[PDB]
């Protein structure tokens, strides 16, 4: 039958879309991948299957039912090989409907665009399909830059951005497990990351740019938004 490629959001089940929620409650089968929060899965009463060899495993269930749900973290169309799964499915006649989600890029609550600091932003992956390194040159000077899958390679990424002209004193922020109870924010200047001084564990969202300090009190290092 039909495959609904659904964004699970960054983690907090409340950030599921109304559409995603209804499809999860109603789906006979939910093919999820690693990126999916336990709280969101617990909302699905149907068959939960942890899911190329991912593609064919998708095809089999799509055929077994009237429709199935293929659940991916954040929004399915960015940084998740969603495009690949869509192609494969369409090429095998399987209809596909995409249900956008709250991308993790937006899970920090910070204004990625802000008057006088950034009029746009860019997002890039530290790991490519195949395991390679990203070409950071087209991204090096965007005022606000967000990096996904950049924790393991943070030193190399930081050094490369410094080489490409980013400000070594630029404030940056790592948000580990954003949206969840284990969310831990790590503040560091770009140079401190390049110097291998920052401890961070994946998965983590990495935001670089002055917007990072937008809600910091003037009179002290206090995050006015959090408090």
> Strand, helix or coil at 35?
coil
Shortest Å distance, C-beta 197 to its own copies: 25
**What does the per-residue mask of binding to its own copies show for 17-56, with x meaning CB under 8 A?**
xxx-xx----------------------------------
Q: Rounded to 5 degrees, what are φ and ψ at 49?
A: -115, 120
Instruction: Rule CB under 8 A: say whether 119 interacts with its own copies.
Output: yes
Residue 103 or 172: the one with the smaller Cβ distance to its own copies is 103
* 37 lines the binding site for Cl ion (CB under 5 A): no
Which two three-digit tokens encode residue 141?
A: 């000077």
Nearest distance, CB of residue 18 and its own copies, angstroms: 5
How many angstroms separate the Cα of 22 from the Cα of each of 45, 67, 77, 89? 11, 13, 20, 22
Could you tell me the smallest distance in angstroms from the CB atom of residue 56 to its own copies? 17
What order do you get walking across the sheet with 29-32 strand by strand?
Answer: 47-50, 29-32, 67-72, 2-7, 96-99
User: For residues 149 and 169, what is the distance between their CA atoms, to the nearest angstrom?
Assistant: 22
Q: How far is CA 19 from the centre of its chain?
A: 19
User: Rule CB under 8 A: which residues touch its own copies?
Assistant: 7, 9-10, 12-19, 21-22, 75, 77-79, 81-84, 86-87, 90, 96, 98-103, 106-107, 109-115, 119-125, 128-130, 134-135, 137-139, 141-143, 211, 214-215, 224-225
């Amino acid at each position: 039958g039909r495959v609904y490629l659904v964004g699970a959001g960054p983690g907090d089940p409340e950030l599921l879309t109304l559409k995603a929620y209804r499809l999860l409650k109603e789906a006979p089968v939910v093919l999820y991948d690693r990126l999916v929060d336990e709280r969101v899965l617990a909302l699905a009463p149907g068959e939960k299957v942890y899911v190329e060899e991912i593609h064919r495993l998708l095809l089999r269930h799509a055929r077994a039912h009237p429709f199935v749900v293929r659940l991916k973290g954040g929004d399915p169309m960015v940084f998740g090989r969603g495009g690949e799964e869509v192609l494969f499915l369409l090429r095998h006649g399987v209809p596909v409907e995409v249900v956008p989600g709250v991308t993790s890029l937006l899970a920090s609550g910070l204004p990625l665009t802000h008057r006088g600091l950034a009029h746009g932003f860019a997002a890039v992956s530290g790991v490519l399909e195949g395991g390679g390194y990203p070409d950071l040159r087209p991204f090096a000077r965007v005022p606000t830059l967000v990096v996904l899958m950049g924790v393991g390679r943070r030193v190399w990424i930081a050094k490369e951005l410094l080489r490409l002209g980013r400000d070594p004193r630029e404030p940056t922020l790592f948000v580990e497990r954003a949206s969840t109870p284990k969310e831990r924010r790590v503040h560091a200047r770009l140079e401190e990351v390049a110097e291998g001084k920052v401890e961070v564990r994946p998965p983590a969202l990495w935001i670089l740019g002055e917007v990072v300090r937008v809600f910091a009190e003037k009179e002290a290092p206090v995050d006015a938004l959090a408090l």
